[PDB]
Symmetry: C2
Subunit: 76 residues, 2 copies
């Protein structure tokens, strides 16, 4: 113990020297899953969007995701 016995620092510090790997590689694969696109529509497009939003009962951001869904899976 004269050697503090803490010299091992918990056996060469088993803290996680193996856990050093910590290859959880969180690498936010979910992050990329979403992108942002700033688009500017016409005044009429906005008014019609509001009516379409209330008619479909959904958010203003969801409706846009819908038109893209009707164009991405159709036009392609």
């Amino acid at each position: 113990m004269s050697l503090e016995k803490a010299h091992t620092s918990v056996k060469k510090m088993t803290f996680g020297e193996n856990r050093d790997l910590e290859r959880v590689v969180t690498a936010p694969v979910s992050s990329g899953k979403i992108k942002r696109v700033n688009v500017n529509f016409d005044e009429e497009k906005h008014t019609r969007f509001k009516a379409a939003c209330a008619r479909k009962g959904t958010s203003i951001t969801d409706v846009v995701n819908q038109l893209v869904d009707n164009w991405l899976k159709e036009n392609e």
Copy 2:
């Protein structure tokens, strides 16, 4: 007289008196005719967005305005 000269703009020098009507009332008109929205597109929706747009020779921004116009004119 010199005094009159002082107020040579007596009548009002028509500085813009007749212009006071301010036809400027003519708001830009184009005012707010363009509204932004900023949407969120899935990784899959974005990957096919650039691919499809590159095929039809359309700007990524114009593509969004296209699907919006379609869904807003087909569903409405």
